[PDB]
Every structure is written in C-alpha cells, then in structure tokens.
Tab-separated table of C-alpha atoms in Angstrom:
chain	number	residue	atom	x	y	z
A	6	UNK	CA	0.856	8.150	7.010
A	7	UNK	CA	3.683	7.066	4.716
A	8	UNK	CA	2.618	4.547	2.024
A	9	UNK	CA	3.406	0.911	2.735
A	10	UNK	CA	5.171	0.876	-0.688
A	11	UNK	CA	7.497	3.763	0.354
A	12	UNK	CA	8.338	1.923	3.605
A	13	UNK	CA	8.971	-1.403	1.693
A	14	UNK	CA	11.188	0.414	-0.858
A	15	UNK	CA	13.423	1.837	1.916
A	16	UNK	CA	13.473	-1.663	3.600
A	17	UNK	CA	14.390	-3.317	0.215
A	18	UNK	CA	17.725	-1.451	0.492
A	19	UNK	CA	18.397	-0.382	4.067
A	20	UNK	CA	19.629	-3.230	6.236
A	21	UNK	CA	18.419	-3.794	9.756
A	22	UNK	CA	20.848	-3.767	12.655
A	23	UNK	CA	19.512	-4.779	16.061
A	24	UNK	CA	22.778	-3.729	17.692
A	25	UNK	CA	24.201	-0.222	17.567
A	26	UNK	CA	27.385	0.543	15.648
A	27	UNK	CA	29.737	3.478	14.919
A	28	UNK	CA	29.426	4.838	11.407
A	29	UNK	CA	32.380	6.313	9.387
A	30	UNK	CA	32.012	9.657	11.199
A	31	UNK	CA	31.987	7.936	14.645
A	32	UNK	CA	28.259	8.475	15.310
A	33	UNK	CA	26.174	5.713	16.860
A	34	UNK	CA	23.549	4.177	14.527
A	35	UNK	CA	20.980	1.402	14.979
A	36	UNK	CA	17.951	-0.142	13.293
A	37	UNK	CA	17.329	1.088	9.769
A	38	UNK	CA	20.102	3.660	9.829
A	39	UNK	CA	18.659	5.531	12.816
A	40	UNK	CA	21.174	7.935	14.397
A	41	UNK	CA	20.966	7.667	18.205
A	42	UNK	CA	20.913	10.920	20.283
A	43	UNK	CA	24.074	11.780	22.330
A	44	UNK	CA	22.853	10.481	25.741
A	45	UNK	CA	21.079	7.302	24.574
A	46	UNK	CA	22.157	4.309	26.589
A	47	UNK	CA	20.660	1.451	24.552
A	48	UNK	CA	22.889	-1.038	22.754
A	49	UNK	CA	20.254	-3.423	21.381
A	50	UNK	CA	16.698	-2.970	20.090
A	51	UNK	CA	13.888	-5.161	18.816
A	52	UNK	CA	12.609	-5.196	15.201
A	53	UNK	CA	9.421	-3.257	16.351
A	54	UNK	CA	11.646	-0.644	18.039
A	55	UNK	CA	13.623	-0.360	14.780
A	56	UNK	CA	10.389	0.051	12.792
A	57	UNK	CA	9.244	2.866	15.109
A	58	UNK	CA	12.560	4.686	14.693
A	59	UNK	CA	12.242	4.401	10.883
A	60	UNK	CA	8.739	5.935	10.995
A	61	UNK	CA	10.037	8.621	13.393
A	62	UNK	CA	12.892	9.527	10.975
A	63	UNK	CA	10.608	9.538	7.905
A	64	UNK	CA	7.934	11.687	9.553
A	65	UNK	CA	10.531	14.150	10.937
A	66	UNK	CA	11.897	14.662	7.493
A	67	UNK	CA	8.342	15.033	6.142
A	68	UNK	CA	7.516	17.788	8.644
A	69	UNK	CA	10.740	19.668	7.850
A	70	UNK	CA	10.261	19.173	4.090
A	71	UNK	CA	6.880	20.749	4.361
A	72	UNK	CA	8.460	23.746	5.742
A	73	UNK	CA	11.229	23.914	2.852
A	74	UNK	CA	8.633	23.160	0.060
A	75	UNK	CA	5.511	24.845	1.489
A	76	UNK	CA	3.496	24.573	-1.724
A	77	UNK	CA	4.408	20.942	-2.427
A	78	UNK	CA	1.224	18.967	-1.969
A	79	UNK	CA	1.933	15.944	-4.322
A	80	UNK	CA	2.478	13.088	-1.827
A	81	UNK	CA	4.355	11.076	-4.450
A	82	UNK	CA	6.936	13.813	-4.867
A	83	UNK	CA	7.170	14.195	-1.022
A	84	UNK	CA	7.790	10.446	-0.638
A	85	UNK	CA	10.349	10.317	-3.462
A	86	UNK	CA	12.250	13.274	-2.053
A	87	UNK	CA	12.281	11.656	1.359
A	88	UNK	CA	13.500	8.310	-0.096
A	89	UNK	CA	16.200	10.171	-2.053
A	90	UNK	CA	17.435	12.013	1.038
A	91	UNK	CA	17.325	8.697	3.003
A	92	UNK	CA	19.552	7.036	0.370
A	93	UNK	CA	22.046	9.924	0.256
A	94	UNK	CA	22.016	10.555	4.018
A	95	UNK	CA	22.688	7.088	5.333
A	96	UNK	CA	25.757	5.053	4.967
A	97	UNK	CA	25.075	1.455	3.951
A	98	UNK	CA	27.523	-1.423	3.684
A	99	UNK	CA	28.547	-3.699	0.875
A	100	UNK	CA	27.064	-7.196	0.818
A	101	UNK	CA	28.638	-9.939	-1.405
A	102	UNK	CA	25.537	-12.288	-0.799
B	6	UNK	CA	25.969	30.216	4.301
B	7	UNK	CA	25.115	29.624	0.616
B	8	UNK	CA	27.473	30.493	-2.206
B	9	UNK	CA	26.767	33.604	-4.270
B	10	UNK	CA	26.578	31.325	-7.363
B	11	UNK	CA	23.875	29.115	-5.749
B	12	UNK	CA	21.852	32.242	-4.882
B	13	UNK	CA	22.294	33.710	-8.371
B	14	UNK	CA	21.181	30.405	-9.920
B	15	UNK	CA	17.971	30.494	-7.914
B	16	UNK	CA	17.407	34.204	-8.940
B	17	UNK	CA	18.116	33.521	-12.621
B	18	UNK	CA	14.945	31.412	-12.651
B	19	UNK	CA	12.690	32.388	-9.811
B	20	UNK	CA	12.066	36.038	-10.512
B	21	UNK	CA	11.103	38.846	-8.276
B	22	UNK	CA	7.774	40.405	-7.385
B	23	UNK	CA	7.914	43.306	-4.895
B	24	UNK	CA	4.083	43.090	-4.702
B	25	UNK	CA	2.213	40.007	-3.384
B	26	UNK	CA	0.405	37.885	-5.955
B	27	UNK	CA	-1.703	34.697	-6.023
B	28	UNK	CA	0.293	32.026	-7.773
B	29	UNK	CA	-1.020	29.178	-10.034
B	30	UNK	CA	-1.918	26.896	-7.082
B	31	UNK	CA	-3.772	29.687	-5.152
B	32	UNK	CA	-1.258	30.805	-2.508
B	33	UNK	CA	-0.210	34.371	-1.814
B	34	UNK	CA	3.488	34.757	-2.610
B	35	UNK	CA	5.980	37.707	-2.647
B	36	UNK	CA	9.664	38.349	-3.376
B	37	UNK	CA	11.514	35.382	-4.859
B	38	UNK	CA	8.582	32.893	-4.551
B	39	UNK	CA	8.216	33.411	-0.765
B	40	UNK	CA	4.818	32.017	0.488
B	41	UNK	CA	3.132	34.579	2.824
B	42	UNK	CA	2.260	33.586	6.403
B	43	UNK	CA	-0.845	35.213	8.067
B	44	UNK	CA	1.484	37.357	10.289
B	45	UNK	CA	3.121	38.865	7.087
B	46	UNK	CA	0.662	41.762	6.525
B	47	UNK	CA	2.766	43.674	3.924
B	48	UNK	CA	1.709	43.406	0.363
B	49	UNK	CA	4.732	45.517	-0.880
B	50	UNK	CA	8.352	44.934	0.082
B	51	UNK	CA	11.847	46.257	-0.773
B	52	UNK	CA	14.459	44.212	-2.700
B	53	UNK	CA	16.377	43.938	0.596
B	54	UNK	CA	13.298	42.417	2.280
B	55	UNK	CA	12.859	40.077	-0.799
B	56	UNK	CA	16.509	38.877	-0.396
B	57	UNK	CA	16.024	38.384	3.366
B	58	UNK	CA	12.914	36.195	2.727
B	59	UNK	CA	14.984	34.202	0.171
B	60	UNK	CA	17.710	33.538	2.720
B	61	UNK	CA	15.016	32.447	5.217
B	62	UNK	CA	13.562	30.097	2.648
B	63	UNK	CA	16.985	28.632	1.777
B	64	UNK	CA	17.696	28.290	5.568
B	65	UNK	CA	14.454	26.261	5.879
B	66	UNK	CA	15.868	23.908	3.257
B	67	UNK	CA	19.210	23.864	5.061
B	68	UNK	CA	17.472	22.925	8.366
B	69	UNK	CA	15.902	19.979	6.515
B	70	UNK	CA	19.258	18.856	5.213
B	71	UNK	CA	20.963	19.302	8.632
B	72	UNK	CA	18.427	17.086	10.262
B	73	UNK	CA	17.856	14.511	7.505
B	74	UNK	CA	21.349	14.365	5.916
B	75	UNK	CA	23.294	15.224	9.158
B	76	UNK	CA	26.590	13.735	7.835
B	77	UNK	CA	26.506	15.500	4.421
B	78	UNK	CA	29.803	17.372	4.197
B	79	UNK	CA	29.710	17.966	0.405
B	80	UNK	CA	28.673	21.638	-0.024
B	81	UNK	CA	28.096	21.196	-3.731
B	82	UNK	CA	25.637	18.307	-3.156
B	83	UNK	CA	24.012	20.370	-0.307
B	84	UNK	CA	23.517	23.301	-2.671
B	85	UNK	CA	22.258	21.256	-5.610
B	86	UNK	CA	19.702	19.515	-3.323
B	87	UNK	CA	18.554	22.924	-2.034
B	88	UNK	CA	18.210	24.321	-5.583
B	89	UNK	CA	16.342	21.228	-6.779
B	90	UNK	CA	13.940	21.409	-3.846
B	91	UNK	CA	13.425	25.160	-4.351
B	92	UNK	CA	12.594	24.499	-7.998
B	93	UNK	CA	10.100	21.705	-7.248
B	94	UNK	CA	8.644	23.411	-4.155
B	95	UNK	CA	8.121	26.935	-5.337
B	96	UNK	CA	6.070	27.846	-8.431
B	97	UNK	CA	7.547	30.104	-11.118
B	98	UNK	CA	6.539	33.740	-11.477
B	99	UNK	CA	6.540	34.956	-15.183
C	6	UNK	CA	16.677	-4.490	-13.658
C	7	UNK	CA	14.624	-2.550	-11.075
C	8	UNK	CA	13.570	-4.024	-7.759
C	9	UNK	CA	9.962	-5.135	-7.329
C	10	UNK	CA	9.705	-2.649	-4.405
C	11	UNK	CA	10.836	0.290	-6.614
C	12	UNK	CA	8.230	-0.691	-9.234
C	13	UNK	CA	5.491	-1.093	-6.615
C	14	UNK	CA	6.358	2.326	-5.159
C	15	UNK	CA	5.900	3.938	-8.555
C	16	UNK	CA	2.528	2.053	-9.019
C	17	UNK	CA	1.277	2.988	-5.543
C	18	UNK	CA	1.202	6.601	-6.742
C	19	UNK	CA	1.055	6.740	-10.493
C	20	UNK	CA	-2.123	4.852	-11.231
C	21	UNK	CA	-3.248	3.012	-14.259
C	22	UNK	CA	-5.388	3.989	-17.220
C	23	UNK	CA	-5.913	1.267	-19.857
C	24	UNK	CA	-7.468	3.980	-22.089
C	25	UNK	CA	-5.511	7.023	-23.374
C	26	UNK	CA	-6.350	10.372	-21.806
C	27	UNK	CA	-5.207	14.008	-22.103
C	28	UNK	CA	-3.416	14.924	-18.919
C	29	UNK	CA	-3.354	18.351	-17.131
C	30	UNK	CA	-0.574	19.760	-19.371
C	31	UNK	CA	-2.278	18.619	-22.648
C	32	UNK	CA	-0.380	15.456	-23.622
C	33	UNK	CA	-1.933	12.124	-24.507
C	34	UNK	CA	-0.894	9.540	-21.916
C	35	UNK	CA	-1.751	5.833	-21.261
C	36	UNK	CA	-0.856	3.067	-18.797
C	37	UNK	CA	1.216	4.216	-15.829
C	38	UNK	CA	1.703	7.838	-17.063
C	39	UNK	CA	3.287	6.756	-20.387
C	40	UNK	CA	3.333	9.704	-22.910
C	41	UNK	CA	2.090	8.500	-26.355
C	42	UNK	CA	4.352	8.849	-29.408
C	43	UNK	CA	2.703	9.426	-32.873
C	44	UNK	CA	3.578	5.797	-33.881
C	45	UNK	CA	1.536	4.477	-30.833
C	46	UNK	CA	-1.917	4.320	-32.510
C	47	UNK	CA	-3.679	2.250	-29.778
C	48	UNK	CA	-5.981	4.075	-27.490
C	49	UNK	CA	-6.687	0.890	-25.369
C	50	UNK	CA	-4.043	-1.432	-23.959
C	51	UNK	CA	-3.772	-4.501	-21.678
C	52	UNK	CA	-2.217	-4.389	-18.173
C	53	UNK	CA	0.714	-6.363	-19.632
C	54	UNK	CA	1.237	-3.656	-22.284
C	55	UNK	CA	0.910	-0.961	-19.496
C	56	UNK	CA	3.677	-2.737	-17.467
C	57	UNK	CA	5.883	-3.042	-20.578
C	58	UNK	CA	5.552	0.743	-21.242
C	59	UNK	CA	6.465	1.353	-17.557
C	60	UNK	CA	9.627	-0.714	-17.876
C	61	UNK	CA	10.493	1.225	-21.065
C	62	UNK	CA	9.977	4.489	-19.242
C	63	UNK	CA	12.109	3.378	-16.267
C	64	UNK	CA	14.792	2.146	-18.773
C	65	UNK	CA	14.819	5.666	-20.301
C	66	UNK	CA	15.631	6.987	-16.836
C	67	UNK	CA	18.246	4.268	-16.385
C	68	UNK	CA	19.909	5.242	-19.718
C	69	UNK	CA	20.146	8.807	-18.372
C	70	UNK	CA	21.772	7.619	-15.183
C	71	UNK	CA	24.179	5.267	-17.044
C	72	UNK	CA	25.403	8.091	-19.172
C	73	UNK	CA	25.354	10.953	-16.649
C	74	UNK	CA	26.218	9.079	-13.410
C	75	UNK	CA	28.357	6.326	-15.105
C	76	UNK	CA	30.192	5.436	-11.839
C	77	UNK	CA	27.045	5.169	-9.649
C	78	UNK	CA	27.199	1.697	-8.118
C	79	UNK	CA	24.635	2.335	-5.331
C	80	UNK	CA	21.399	0.644	-6.521
C	81	UNK	CA	19.361	2.299	-3.805
C	82	UNK	CA	20.493	5.803	-4.882
C	83	UNK	CA	19.906	4.766	-8.569
C	84	UNK	CA	16.353	3.712	-7.738
C	85	UNK	CA	15.515	6.729	-5.593
C	86	UNK	CA	16.772	9.073	-8.372
C	87	UNK	CA	14.621	7.194	-10.911
C	88	UNK	CA	11.526	7.391	-8.663
C	89	UNK	CA	12.088	11.090	-7.963
C	90	UNK	CA	12.466	11.848	-11.663
C	91	UNK	CA	9.381	9.766	-12.521
C	92	UNK	CA	7.406	11.728	-9.937
C	93	UNK	CA	8.554	15.146	-11.196
C	94	UNK	CA	8.426	14.174	-14.889
C	95	UNK	CA	5.114	12.428	-15.160
C	96	UNK	CA	1.798	14.006	-14.098
C	97	UNK	CA	-0.544	12.150	-11.739
C	98	UNK	CA	-3.702	10.445	-12.958
C	99	UNK	CA	-6.599	10.572	-10.348
D	6	UNK	CA	21.392	27.035	-24.093
D	7	UNK	CA	22.189	26.439	-20.426
D	8	UNK	CA	21.904	29.583	-18.246
D	9	UNK	CA	25.155	31.346	-17.427
D	10	UNK	CA	24.103	31.051	-13.734
D	11	UNK	CA	23.813	27.221	-14.006
D	12	UNK	CA	27.279	27.063	-15.625
D	13	UNK	CA	28.782	29.398	-12.904
D	14	UNK	CA	27.167	27.303	-10.125
D	15	UNK	CA	28.797	24.087	-11.435
D	16	UNK	CA	32.149	26.010	-11.830
D	17	UNK	CA	31.824	27.390	-8.222
D	18	UNK	CA	32.280	23.766	-7.063
D	19	UNK	CA	33.860	21.651	-9.785
D	20	UNK	CA	37.596	22.196	-10.072
D	21	UNK	CA	39.372	22.498	-13.378
D	22	UNK	CA	42.118	20.072	-14.317
D	23	UNK	CA	44.076	20.794	-17.488
D	24	UNK	CA	45.812	17.426	-17.224
D	25	UNK	CA	44.019	14.089	-17.239
D	26	UNK	CA	43.931	11.889	-14.147
D	27	UNK	CA	42.632	8.465	-13.020
D	28	UNK	CA	39.598	8.657	-10.775
D	29	UNK	CA	38.860	6.154	-7.916
D	30	UNK	CA	37.414	3.652	-10.415
D	31	UNK	CA	40.498	3.954	-12.702
D	32	UNK	CA	38.740	5.959	-15.445
D	33	UNK	CA	40.506	8.869	-17.116
D	34	UNK	CA	39.013	12.314	-16.342
D	35	UNK	CA	39.947	15.848	-17.413
D	36	UNK	CA	38.630	19.406	-17.373
D	37	UNK	CA	35.532	19.902	-15.258
D	38	UNK	CA	35.118	16.235	-14.424
D	39	UNK	CA	34.825	15.170	-18.069
D	40	UNK	CA	35.254	11.400	-18.535
D	41	UNK	CA	37.462	10.741	-21.586
D	42	UNK	CA	36.374	8.016	-24.095
D	43	UNK	CA	38.422	4.741	-24.170
D	44	UNK	CA	40.633	5.581	-27.205
D	45	UNK	CA	41.316	9.267	-26.452
D	46	UNK	CA	44.991	10.056	-26.667
D	47	UNK	CA	45.100	13.558	-25.156
D	48	UNK	CA	46.849	14.201	-21.851
D	49	UNK	CA	46.468	17.986	-21.621
D	50	UNK	CA	43.759	20.438	-22.702
D	51	UNK	CA	43.218	24.183	-22.698
D	52	UNK	CA	40.622	26.015	-20.550
D	53	UNK	CA	38.433	26.568	-23.736
D	54	UNK	CA	38.641	22.827	-24.503
D	55	UNK	CA	37.564	22.126	-20.903
D	56	UNK	CA	34.648	24.567	-21.244
D	57	UNK	CA	33.477	22.826	-24.439
D	58	UNK	CA	33.569	19.425	-22.732
D	59	UNK	CA	31.489	20.822	-19.830
D	60	UNK	CA	28.849	22.137	-22.268
D	61	UNK	CA	28.966	18.795	-24.131
D	62	UNK	CA	28.348	16.852	-20.866
D	63	UNK	CA	25.550	19.197	-19.720
D	64	UNK	CA	23.738	19.127	-23.067
D	65	UNK	CA	24.055	15.314	-23.347
D	66	UNK	CA	22.430	14.921	-20.001
D	67	UNK	CA	19.745	17.444	-21.013
D	68	UNK	CA	18.869	15.479	-24.161
D	69	UNK	CA	18.665	12.197	-22.223
D	70	UNK	CA	16.681	13.835	-19.395
D	71	UNK	CA	14.159	14.996	-21.902
D	72	UNK	CA	13.629	11.512	-22.885
D	73	UNK	CA	13.210	10.254	-19.105
D	74	UNK	CA	10.943	13.264	-18.155
D	75	UNK	CA	9.115	13.874	-21.459
D	76	UNK	CA	6.557	16.267	-19.978
D	77	UNK	CA	9.075	18.307	-17.976
D	78	UNK	CA	9.175	21.712	-19.601
D	79	UNK	CA	10.262	23.902	-16.569
D	80	UNK	CA	13.860	24.838	-17.494
D	81	UNK	CA	14.657	25.609	-13.858
D	82	UNK	CA	13.775	22.085	-12.798
D	83	UNK	CA	15.769	20.669	-15.800
D	84	UNK	CA	18.835	22.709	-14.787
D	85	UNK	CA	18.558	21.780	-11.099
D	86	UNK	CA	18.222	18.097	-11.916
D	87	UNK	CA	21.243	18.300	-14.171
D	88	UNK	CA	23.293	20.131	-11.479
D	89	UNK	CA	22.206	17.521	-8.911
D	90	UNK	CA	23.255	14.621	-11.136
D	91	UNK	CA	26.562	16.454	-11.891
D	92	UNK	CA	27.280	16.749	-8.142
D	93	UNK	CA	26.423	13.102	-7.409
D	94	UNK	CA	28.076	11.718	-10.556
D	95	UNK	CA	31.493	13.290	-10.322
D	96	UNK	CA	34.127	12.680	-7.796
D	97	UNK	CA	35.695	15.867	-6.445
D	98	UNK	CA	38.668	16.232	-4.125
D	99	UNK	CA	39.139	17.815	-0.749
D	100	UNK	CA	40.794	21.231	-0.627
D	101	UNK	CA	42.171	22.606	2.713
D	102	UNK	CA	42.648	26.172	1.114
C-alpha cells in the first residue's frame, strides 16, 4: 500500500542490519531500524524478514496517523509525514564511506 | 500531559464551535475541529466538553508519537510535531 | 544536491503538466507543481525545463533549511523535511 | 505579526541566555537560541534584545518559508512549521529542575 518510491526513499537513508544491536537507549533494534518487542529471541534475520518489519512499522504508523489526522486523505502528505517521523524516530549511524 | 502554551497555540488558530458543522471537506465537526463519530449524537456541546474532545484529539496524536517515535524524549519537539499534525490534519473553522 | 530517491518520491506524487494550469486555490502552475512568476511567460515547457523548475523549487526549500536549521547535518531529516514541505506547500495535480 | 501564542509556545521550551555561549558545533549563540553572526562583538544582551532577536529569527524563517511553500496561506500551518523547525534547529540543554 505504501508507494515503492516512499519505500526506496527510506531505504536510501536507513541502513540494513541483519543482526540485532542495542541502540543509545539500550533497546534492541534490527533490520531497517525495527525495534524488537521485549520477549523476542531472534538475533539474526534475513533481508526479506527485514523488509516485512519495515512494512509492518510503516503501516502501523499509517493506521495511527489516520486516527490523529482523521480528515487527512492526501496520500502524499501521509507518506511524507511518515517518512519524517521515521527519520526523527530512528537513530542512524555515521558512515565515512 | 501537554503544556498550557501548546494548548493555547492550538486554540489561537483552531477556533471553537459549540454546534456541529460540516467543514470544507464534508465532515461533521464540533468543538476545536473535533471530527464526529457516529456514536457522538450531540449536535451542541459545552466548552468543557469541547476542551475534553481537544485533549482526546491531542492524545490520539500522542499515541502516534509514542508508538512511532518511542525514544523521543524532547517535549518541545513532541509538542511541535503534535501542533503541526493538528494544523495539517484538521481544517480551520472561520 | 538531493538524492535521486528523494526526487523520485516527490515525482511519484506530484505529477507533471507540460502546460500551465490554474490549480484548486487559483494560482497558475506548471511542471511538477511549480507556481508561475509574472516573468515566466511560457505556457508550455519541456520535461527538462519541468525538472529544472523542480530543482529550483527544492533549492528554495534547501535555502530555508540552511538558514533556519543551519546546524542540521542529517541528510535524511533534511530530505524528509523538504518532501513534507513540498507536499503541504504545493497542491496536487490529478 | 507572529501570534502571541506562537511566541509563548517557543518561550515555554526555549531557555533564555543573556550571555553568549558556544554550542556543540562551536558556534556562538545567545538569547533564545539566536546564532550570532561571525563578526559580532557582544557578550551580553538584555531580555528586550533577546526578544528582538527571537522575532528577527522567526520572521526570517517566515519570509524564506513563503518562498519554499508559495501557495501556503494558512497562518496556522506557517506558524507550526516554523515552531517545528525552531525545535529541530536549536540545541537545548537538559534541566533536572
């Protein structure tokens, strides 16, 4: 349901991690910045599992946005708001090439 | 939950209707831009009820931020995101 | 200046008109939602001219961020702010 | 020209400094997060001077926003975008009471 361009834009900037890591706040993260639930036992995932978690995270935020902005029907503005929150809400790491 | 200044900023611009009205995009709205649900059968409310609907609506935006920005610990940025979304997501009155 | 993915995201949604048209709020627009100035006398442009106007319009948003977020060194956040502002600030085509 | 409520909202959260300081990037800042120009010689300012710099910063961003969002006429959305940029664009400091 998200545009392929919105998904490519987030993947232009969000790195992929196939192994889980602790972020600055000590929470476990994996894939494209996916925060794991408290009981999750996995350490590694596949690229397809990471893609599914990214779609899960984007669609969850879309459903909850709908409920904050009930009259907002412009899908462009929904996607840009979601990409904005994704960029503010996820810690990324510096890369010197 | 929200600062009095954040709430006042939203009321400076949103504007109150104690009677329901059909806004520019065809939805029934009341209070401070609150979109009516089919279980909300009142077409006239008190200012206290208008404020309570506003806090529900801001809480809906807070739920979004708690789930999609779970590590945001900057209350100013939280509040500015909520005000921005309220301004884009609700239509103006008059 | 802007990533190809950021540009593609804006083109996925904005939509191209090689002919000028009066948008929903009454302004003359052309290309990818580019608002005409009185010195822009063409009413028909090439796709290359449409892309050049888009890069001017994104540069106007970049000038805003360079002056009002001068310490922002997160290109992703820069680009998401630019796309959000483009989506709120330009009307859709069809 | 900005609403008193927009100005009070930014002052609810942005602290006032009457003396200049170096931010994380080594730039000089004073007042309500006002970045000083390269040649400025002042070290201290008054609260009225800080207020004028805040209005200067808000109105500069308004003029440049106008030029990025030429069709945006809703003053509420202009003010919220400006407050958002102000909160993202300025470093603030932790206060334990």
